[PDB]
Amino acid sequence: PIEESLAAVIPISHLGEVGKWANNVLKIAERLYVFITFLTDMGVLEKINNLYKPANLKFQKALGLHDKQLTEETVSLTLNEYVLPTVSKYSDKIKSPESLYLLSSLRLLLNSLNALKLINEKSTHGKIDELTYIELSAAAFNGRHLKNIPRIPIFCILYNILTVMSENLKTESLFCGSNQYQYYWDLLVIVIAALETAVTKDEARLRVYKELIDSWIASVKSKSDIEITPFLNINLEFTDVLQLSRGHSITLLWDIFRKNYPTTSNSWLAFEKLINLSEKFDKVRLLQFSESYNSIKDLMDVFRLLNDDVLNNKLSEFNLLLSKLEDGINELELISNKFLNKRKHYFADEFDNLIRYTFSVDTAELIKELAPASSLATQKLTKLITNKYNYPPIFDVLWTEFTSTIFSSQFLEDVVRKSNNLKSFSGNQIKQSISDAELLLSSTIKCSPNLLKSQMEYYKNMLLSWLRKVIDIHVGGDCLKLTLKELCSLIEEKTASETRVTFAEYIFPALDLAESSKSLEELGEAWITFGTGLLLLFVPDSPYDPAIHDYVLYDLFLKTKTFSQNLMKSWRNVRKVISGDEEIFTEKLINTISDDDAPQSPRVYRTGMSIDSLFDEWMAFLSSTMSSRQIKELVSSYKCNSDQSDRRLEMLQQNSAHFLNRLESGYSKFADLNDILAGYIYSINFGFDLLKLQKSKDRASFQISPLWSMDPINISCAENVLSAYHELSRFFKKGDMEDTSIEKVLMYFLTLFKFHKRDTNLLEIFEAALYTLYSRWSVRRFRQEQYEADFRKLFNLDDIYFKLADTYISVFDKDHDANFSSELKSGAIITTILSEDLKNTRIEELKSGSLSAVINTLDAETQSFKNTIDFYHDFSIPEFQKAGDIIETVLKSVLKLLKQWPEHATLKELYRVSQEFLNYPIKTPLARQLQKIEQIYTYLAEWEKYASSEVSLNNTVKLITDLIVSWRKLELRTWKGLFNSEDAKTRKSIGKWWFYLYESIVISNFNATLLVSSLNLFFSKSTLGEFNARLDLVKAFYKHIQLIGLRSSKIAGLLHNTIKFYYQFKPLIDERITNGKKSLEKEIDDIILLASWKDVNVDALKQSSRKSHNNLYKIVRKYRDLLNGDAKTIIEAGLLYXXXXXXXXXXXXXXXXXXXXXXXXXXXXXXXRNIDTVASNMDSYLEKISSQEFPNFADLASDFYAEAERLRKETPNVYRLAYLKTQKSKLLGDALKELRRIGLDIQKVQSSTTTILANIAPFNNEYLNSSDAFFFKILDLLPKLRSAAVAAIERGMALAQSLMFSLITVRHPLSEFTNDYCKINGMMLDLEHFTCLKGDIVHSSLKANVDNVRLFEKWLPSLLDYAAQTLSVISKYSATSEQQKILLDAKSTLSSFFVHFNSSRIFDSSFIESYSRFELFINELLKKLENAKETGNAFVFDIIIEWIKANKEDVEQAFRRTFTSIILSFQKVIGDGIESTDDNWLSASFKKVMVNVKLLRSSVVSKNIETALSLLKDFDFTTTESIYVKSVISFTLPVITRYYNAMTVVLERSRIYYTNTSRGMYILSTILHSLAKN
């Protein structure tokens, strides 16, 4: 249509522009006239006619002459043929392709410049009423204005383009340049394009048009054209207004972090349909039981196959296969309508918190097994197996409308708490919870390496693999192999001028602080500075979009292909006018645009909706509360810790929660820039939660964390338990009364003093742990002063006090063989007290020591509900589970036969009862459970009678009948014994006895006559059944004082006599009970044999029970008369009345036969002694002591007892009397005259029994406990003599006083004698093995290594038993079971080592060659565990490796002083004669025992041996002067072995003499006792 004006050139200008003949026709004829006026108003018609001036002169001269014309006879095409090409003498560009674009550019400049006249005329019509944006941008250019929209100013800038083209083509007159008219065509299409996309919206589409008219300047300047100099200012104002200042790097950071997204309009409408189904699947997943996890795991896989099929652009079977998943959920919903027992979501926090330790791209299979039995939605799971996911995936789980549960032990403190409180639940949750705690064991085993790794040095790693990727794309080259100055030089060459400021102010401090991070504060500050860093490099001020740049370069290609095809078809009609039918030269001259030049137009499709509304929303939020002035106030507040810290942050995490939820459901079409921004707001919220977990570690009133028990490495350290008591001192003292939780912690420290086998380091936490138990009783008395129980009623503070003294008895035992299996179940109870009551504790990471104990607690519970007592008290899960199934099968048959019937009463009544039976919790006794199975049998029996024969429930009545019979047999077993519970209820009075003895014994230790009178009331005012429990507790205070040692030895003497004196009456009290029980055991055994069934008749069984319960209450009531009878009657009655063995200590020639050469080998022995004359005279004098024999007194007293038996028993007492009265006065006159002959302040000592029981010496040594077998026989009848006691009685009572005073003062030197006797016996055996010593004395170098062996003696065989248990729990859930053989073989070879280190009492030098073999075995044991810590689990072997690595001249004078004091001590003994029953032998034989014990002076001789052995075991000697010391100790050994044999003769003679006179005292006193009564 400009060629139609070019072909219509008739000379001159189609008759000289006739006068508007096209107007005489009258749109195509009127618009063509405007192009001709535009052709003549410029000089374009006048510049062409100056080109034909050589052509007109050449045609005039060559051809015939004629009249001259103004314009030549040539068309305006000017480029065909026919010497018009030879008019290219000047301006040689007609052969060039710029010839056709001269006439064609004025067509397009006209059509665009006149289009701006129409819009500018429209601006003066209206104002702000259904106008366009380009029309409203002319409001600042014209009069009529508006209210807004002056930011882009397109009309004032898309008008200076066309006036330069109006100013250049008007005054050029050149038609010759380097492709000028080629370059005036591509600009004049962009101006058409900048007018179409500026009508309504899209400020973001004007980012391409500041580059298309900027690459055009760089193209016209590369052609060396002089036209670029002429204007040079067509976009230097357009970039002044539209430029951006905040984030320049959005166009470069978008490309590498982008994931795949669908590309068609048909896909996002179907992608929303899949998430619409993915929400309905979540509501069905939380309603299925444990058997339907084979079908949910299939339906959570098909969503992955459809997430790969939406992206595949393959929609053929999509709508078909998506209906199959609707058919799959509807089948899964149909089962969900039939569940009568709704699923209680239990362990909801256990499976939710095992995801956070696993949720990443790696280990994507462990998450899928944790997926369906949890609370994680399926729309978040499909971003794990497929790697469509962005930024590290922990951030998508933490915040819900949980960062403390990933860096603490809060997972493990809650598994223990939900396991102890499991048994207090209803009866519907026992078949669902044994399959819920079983799946939790199969999860913590398979996630064991994920729990144990470091969690504060792991997120440091995932920052440096994500901070060194941002520097990788900005700075060219790798950020690892580059210096600190080499990276700063490449910022100015690769990046802009504004990003250089923030890249050296926020990111480079976020790399320095990420390397020097040692706490959670230096890593939480290095994460937030990175968080504010990439918000100044991604978010723009004005709307910039890196995806519009590809969708305009295709729309511009679509328009310049349209104008090229418009130019071809409008020119094709001109071919039939002044041309032939083959070719025109301008057909070659025009450029044809190619079809195969598509500039890759789909990346991510964005439709005509404007994105300029989104970037208004981001800068309305990021400048509101996420600015750099809003975030630096919180960092400057946490560092100062002034005030109001944790309440600004919750306002911050709530603003960004609704913000990222606005963008998720917002705009529905593109998530490229939403996902990358979401990884920068989730990151900066994680940077503050790293400062919550630092200030909570800074507040610490108690440095003892929970889970202080349930770890075998913190209990076994003897120093650590002592340091865990001085820190809880603000918890025991600052407590309130009636709390009943402080007194359950002090129970646990008494089971650690037992567990360490009563060490001397833990004695402070055993004495001071009992004093606060008494102080919580001394206050509760200050405020107080200011069918078993059902038939007993017809006619918690005492369960703690009862257990504050059962542990106090069980500590003081012989041996325990301590283990870790039963000492951690008592630790699982204290942590539920310590984590609920005690606050402000320490936060720590999970360790391998505490995971080995919680797996033991879950498998201890789930093996108690499966594997298989006292009737009407027990709970019996394995019995309630059999009843829970046999009733549920009846409940199923009711609902089958209810829907046609419903209105009956029997089918309604038992349906209510059967629902009530399954609702009973498992803490109920079997009495209430037998009642509800009795009522449901009677309703089932009467419905079988009235109904027809089509019922067929014979199979259910027979099973209920045999179960009720099976529960009556367990009732008969409680009637059989029935006294073990009665003996325990009288044992429960221990808890108030312990505090009564602690006030009189220990506080007096903290006098002698005050204790016995306070203890005589403890045994006298007592019962008969609770008498053995008193003797079993005073012994627990007798071993409490021997545990203290020799600090108060008197208070252990006041308590040993009173135990043995009241142990004397125990066979009388035990006889009174065991014969009275024979009358009551037969009566109960008769009534049990009556209650037996034949032809069962279950209704008759209940009536036979109540008759049996009435008779059994009286027998228990009669049995309480034997127990609660008084015990004062037996004590005041005395004993009835036939004489004992001894230890018989005799060992002489064991060490008498290296002594012959020892005399010759011995340097000062000649300074101040033979051995042949000494050791022979020492043995010659030993015979004279052993030949001396004392007569017995029990033979004299037994002579009178046989004479008084004949004189008394032969009397027939019929009123022979005068002959008998003389004979009666003979033996009364002979006995009191015989005892006057043989020997014989006394009354100030012997007032009563409680006076001589105080100031008396004990016989605690275990050689002569038989010597007190008769002196406590003469203490029962000592008050009975004073009650009855006419001149012989006053003489006989005064005669037994002087013999008692000569029997009390023997006990004190004789008990001191056996105190030194057992010391010299234990030191004789030290110097005996010291003669057979073959090496050297290494006791300064080997004594420290024995303690290292003995510390491995008591613990290391016990940890091997504990590590052999947790490998059996893993063996039930894994295949790693062959690792048990490398611990039992490691245990059996240790038994060959600890016997060798215990077989020697004094140590040799050969053990240094044997201790190095033990040290080599540990380094070989430590390698066998490391090679076995593979293809399995590591937390079992981790604590045994961690514990092992955490635990890996003058002597001749001392043997001369004990040799001069052993002869002078023995010389004074023979200074008194031996002299073998003549006269006065009771005042001499009780004197001779006091002389021979005194003259041995065993307190001095056994003292010099104590100083002599101290110079041989403390210090050490080399291989020199060691054969000389061994020649001295073997020189004075055959003297000590004779002095020890001089003590086995004096002791064995004065022990038999003491058991004979005390037996003679007992026979004589019963004669005087019967004389005063008869």
Residue numbers in the entry: 2356 to 2381, 2390 to 2764, 2772 to 3156, 3174 to 3182, 3202 to 3274, 3280 to 3417, 3427 to 3557, 3559 to 3560, ...
Quote the passages of the study that discuss this structure, keeping the authors' original sentences.
The AAA+ (ATPases Associated with various cellular Activities) family member Rea1 (or Midasin) consists of nearly 5000 amino acids and generates force to mechanically remove assembly factors. The Rea1 tail is subdivided into an α-helical linker region, a D/E-rich region, and a MIDAS (Metal-Ion-Dependent Adhesion Site) domain which is responsible for the interaction with the Ytm1 and Rsa4 substrates.
The Rea1 linker map revealed side-chains throughout. In addition to the stem and middle domain, the Rea1 linker also comprises three α-helical bundles at its top (top1-top3).
